[PDB]
Symmetry: D2
Subunit: 31 residues, 4 copies
Amino acid sequence: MKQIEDKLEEILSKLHHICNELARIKKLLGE
Amino acid sequence: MKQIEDKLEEILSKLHHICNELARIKKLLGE
Amino acid sequence: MKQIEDKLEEILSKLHHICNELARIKKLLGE
Amino acid sequence: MKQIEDKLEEILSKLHHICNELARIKKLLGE
């Protein structure tokens, strides 16, 4: 269960790179 | 194209909301 | 904790609409 | 544009992998 709670944070971090990346996509699509 | 952008903006907003959801399950479990 | 385990599934389902939607975007970007 | 598509394909593959990650935390907790 700190097993769980720390995978959950790794998932968080990856979800944030993802959001960074859709936003950058969105920025290109826009130029 | 304004419609691809609008979707991307809306995907991001559903991401961010899942990110909040998840950080809170992280909260809980750390209890 | 079935509280937790069922939010986790709602999150799953939303992550799947998301993937459906990036793929459809990707399909438009491609025509 | 082939590069937007390639990214989108790669975001989706990181999603799908988070989806698997999460369904398994769901597994665990249902124990």
